[PDB]
Symmetry: D2
Subunit: 340 residues, 4 copies
């Protein structure tokens, strides 16, 4: 009505799925990575899930370069690390800001969202087709139909871990999903989310044809917590123990994924290397509860603001550079061989 200025046409998921179908290789990649993460979340596999990549995708060419480098390390460190690339097309803002490649691919408030979906699905498809699994945050309620079939692992953001519609979304997603602890370090909201997402739900959603409908979900038991800090970090064994106690109390597996960035690094990118030190000591000491980690990495460390932009630098959160990334990864895989 009065506060809706304009309404514009939107391609339906089925149109993106027809233009950019999954290649056989892409399908195989997704299936294998999901099965491997299920094996890790059920304890049958001792390796570590590493979700690593840019805070946000804004340049498909650099992403293709990053993916080529990360894919090499995935094949080399595969005995200790299940590497999944961060391919974030959606970004939650504390108040306002650039919301990601889908919402605004030209970074200029043009909102060419149909091109955003075309660009994002094609990049996601090419990455998977090369053999590299991909991960994203599921923030929007309507975009998942265009992308989810190419997602090997998903995240629910700290500012939406408490959101019913997002817990419902998780309960129907074909991939494992991680829920961030609240902005204040509150762990309870995430356990409740894991519990909710493991149950069936009945709710309103949008179909592959772009039409609203009633949807019934089965429940997703491949769900786990992601520690991302609060006013202070929470990546330490002590914190891990507290969390593992809350998980056992709730009838849930005492498994944790540790995010080296955001509140766990105080928004200082280089601090991810020190969080890595601490977590690697926990693994080498015997912590089987750390089943995964998450790292904000890019070709060039730091971040830049939004006219032409520097190559390989994040336009959102500051990331560690590739050299630090190659090193961080070997450290993690060294700690995994020690724990084994």
């Amino acid at each position: 009505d009065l506060r809706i200025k304009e309404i514009k046409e939107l391609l339906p998921p089925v149109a993106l799925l027809e233009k950019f179908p999954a290649t056989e290789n892409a399908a195989n990649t997704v299936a294998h990575a999901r099965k491997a993460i299920h094996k890790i979340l059920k304890g049958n596999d001792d390796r570590l899930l590493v979700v690593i990549g840019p805070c946000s995708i804004h340049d498909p060419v650099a992403a293709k370069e990053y993916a080529t480098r990360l894919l090499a390390l995935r094949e080399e460190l595969k005995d200790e690390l299940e590497i999944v690339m961060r391919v974030y097309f959606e970004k939650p803002r504390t108040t306002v800001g650039w919301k990601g490649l889908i919402n605004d691919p030209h970074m200029d408030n043009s909102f060419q969202i149909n091109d955003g979906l075309r660009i994002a699905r094609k990049l996601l498809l090419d990455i998977n087709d090369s053999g590299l699994p991909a991960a994203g945050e599921f923030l929007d309620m309507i975009t998942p139909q265009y992308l989810a079939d190419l997602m090997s692992w998903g995240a629910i953001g700290a500012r939406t871990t408490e959101s019913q519609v997002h817990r419902e979304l998780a309960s129907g997603l074909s991939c494992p999903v991680g829920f961030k602890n609240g902005t204040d370090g509150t762990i309870k909201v995430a356990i409740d989310a894991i519990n909710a997402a493991g149950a069936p739900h009945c709710f309103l959603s949008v179909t592959k044809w772009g039409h609203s409908a009633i949807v019934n979900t089965s429940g997703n038991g491949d769900c786990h917590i992601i520690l991302r800090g609060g006013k202070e970090p929470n990546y330490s064994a002590k914190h891990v123990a507290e969390v593992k106690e809350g998980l056992n109390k709730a009838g849930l597996p005492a498994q944790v994924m540790i995010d080296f960035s955001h509140a766990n690094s105080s928004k200082q990118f280089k601090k991810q290397m020190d969080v890595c030190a601490d977590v690697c000591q926990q693994i080498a000491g015997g912590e089987k509860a750390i089943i995964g980690v998450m790292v904000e990495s890019h070709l060039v460390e730091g971040n830049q603001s939004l006219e032409p932009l520097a190559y390989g630098k994040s336009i959102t959160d500051a990331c560690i550079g590739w050299e630090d990334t190659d090193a961080l990864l070997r450290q993690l895989a060294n700690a995994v061989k020690a724990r084994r």
Copy 2:
């Protein structure tokens, strides 16, 4: 989609708008109320916005009797109060329970949402058509298209004040919106939410036709905080909130939720909160621009065999006699603050 078991047809919004179109009376009710709340939020009216009514509606018949009683008080106290009926269809919770009138109108877990939507719109239509404005809660992104044209005020869920998708929704709502503070009593997320909601946004949404589309909003400047709690209705807390709002550059105004934490989960304590808030107002507090009270015909609650008439099946409410006294307490207070 291997964790999606079934997909069933949903009536498009235009089907419910064609079946239950707004009468001229209902449309006038909504327009007048929205204007009145804007005037209060702009500091151009010294009257108190009162959103009052059941925790959740589970019986349209009892809701219409409530609306008749409340309408009478709305006319008697209009010089001091802008009375809006709380027409909430669900109690958001994580534990198991009735999913509300839209999700489960027959209260049996049959999830007859088409039926629920029909019942909800018809009730909203009837209440507005009688002259009583209605206030709702926005818990998802798809049902507002069926109902918001009959809402004069809305509240975003407490568990979603932080969510970008709910802030995007508020940016394009035609009615004023209240954002609840944090479970710790902090006001930062609600300030972030008011800022975000006041900005223009572009996002994906379902249209009146039942199809996803791209929508651009203007931003909603009629948003405010709701203080809902340990309790935070006290004058110290109100001063603290006013300070945070002034520093953030927002108007130092607040709506106070008398129920839940602010009442330590004891329905009768809403009368204690009322006594305190009335004290703050009569002494001169102009920041308190609204209140929220959980009220029904019959006080208390019951668990969902027949049910007691007019008694909440969700959270406990004050009953009509207390409601009549509370509203007179608030009105006498508005007279005092004035002169």
Copy 3:
């Protein structure tokens, strides 16, 4: 799309069905009438189906006045006639012209089709709720979803009996369907259509949600020919016998509905009474194959034109000329008398 000037929002059928649901009595009218026509078609009832009423609906008020009068005769004559009102909202044109109430309800080329659908369904609902069944021509491929649940009988026009998409539509309609012979008098196109409509089909159509979809139909066994004349009228006994033998050779029951109007009256509205006199003699003489008739009838006889700009007369056709109410009463009593004589 260089020749598509404008595209506009259309209410989906679920909106009209939700706004105007069938009442209990309306649904009863439709179900009873369809069953009664099925019975006549199977040879288990000796009554005459009579489809009668305006060439086109353009005024809901006159249409309801007409319906009330017709309903009273429907009740009075129901041992002899199964009376169904023509409630035609769609008109096929020889070239160009007003396409009917749905396409253009204000009759001024404003094409307010959403209001037309609303006006049309509400009228169909009021007429059925009163107890009077309704008949229409199925011309448009999208409008049936808005109306077909309130239709007891349908016609596929002379210009579309040959059309594959209309034969497909008929194969999935829940009501009996009449196929008019071709505009040049050809019977075979009508027999082919009956056989086509009796078979299952798979085709593209629009659902009640206004979306395209793939539909599978079961086939419609309640189809028959309508005799509407060609270069010359084809209502006489010589013509009915050729149609009877033509139908049997194709393996179909020798049954016919005769349209008294259009080419069988040589487009001279009062000649419907001359056809009536001949068809009555045939029926009362023992002709069982004549299972129905069709008559263009209004409150006031004649027609009038919209081209004038003059205010329209009440109760008078803006399309084909029609007989007025007095002749209509006399004609229905003639038919009932003949059906009684056929029996005794």
Copy 4:
């Protein structure tokens, strides 16, 4: 809905458009061919439109082989003939085609048939061979009409208001067949109705019903296909020309060599060719086009052999080369 058994999902047009967008080559083929046919119909080109190809496409491989052979004769005889391939994906009966049942088994895999048909049309146009189609359905056109340079309304639907409405909004020129009996009145009526603007309900590229308004289509003409007796002779053209002139329309005609004009015999198409060539070479400027049922192999088959029709019987490639050259020489003599 007692007589409706099942309702199955259908890809919206936007899905097939996104999967199979028009190459710039395809788009240019379409545009140039449409503008050239306009020029023939406005009488500013003495060239002859030739719509030629199989009665029906059942094998995309054989259809692409035909397209290749025909493109050669197209560029060779371009100064006399505007050659457009007949790519007929919907068939009228009383098997509805590759779109309705691509695998030919009553499996009715229409989403696959739509995918196959749009791909074949896109490939043929990308090559430089414009395509011609029959418009039988009101929904299929939104998935294929962008790749069509000319279209026909079948004889069984010339009289139908809903097909005239569709014709009035098509971006391509349209031919209307005379009805089964040699009479042109329904076809003259159809040309007049399709020339006028119309408002009607249709399905958009998004798969939703909506109200559309059309401008009218002035690029419509008659197609003589005969009836009980053939109507391609000079006497017949003259009668049709007088009828057209009385109705107020350009006195122009396309002549279908097959069907009744051939009395259901594929070799008689060569005889009609003889006759029409004699008429054109004698100075008949009113014959602006012809239609021939041609395949790589001659004849037909039922319920397969390669490059042979499973519908109407067609002429083989040798006869096809000969006929195209005959028409070209005839148009050369008309010009000279």
